Design a binder for this molecule. Sequence first.
Ligand SMILES: [Ca+2]
Ligand SMILES: [Zn+2]
Ligand SMILES: [Zn+2]
Ligand SMILES: [Zn+2]
Ligand SMILES: [Zn+2]
Ligand SMILES: [Zn+2]
Lengths: 29, 29, 29
Amino acid sequence: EWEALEKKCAALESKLQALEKKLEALEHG
Amino acid sequence: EWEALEKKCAALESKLQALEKKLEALEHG
Amino acid sequence: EWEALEKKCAALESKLQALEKKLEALEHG
Ligand SMILES: [Ca+2]
Ligand SMILES: [Zn+2]
Ligand SMILES: [Zn+2]
Ligand SMILES: [Zn+2]
Ligand SMILES: [Zn+2]
Ligand SMILES: [Zn+2]
């Protein structure tokens, strides 16, 4: 249970970082 | 305390999915 | 360990909220 939650947060963090970079691209055309 | 952090992570996953849908709509629509 | 996961989840929430803000700015120009 605990190990799954930790892994879920690590996945979220990767996904958020990618989304930040994709927004930055869109911001700039 | 456990349930509260589980719910938080599920809510962040839901939000991130909604944010990616809106990004796709902005980029392509 | 629990306190570090809770800190990480709060940081992801803050991040996500920033990204939602920035997507809404792009949706309006
Ligand atoms: Ca559970
Ligand atoms: Zn651990
Ligand atoms: Zn710039
Ligand atoms: Zn707590
Ligand atoms: Zn796309
Ligand atoms: Zn396209």
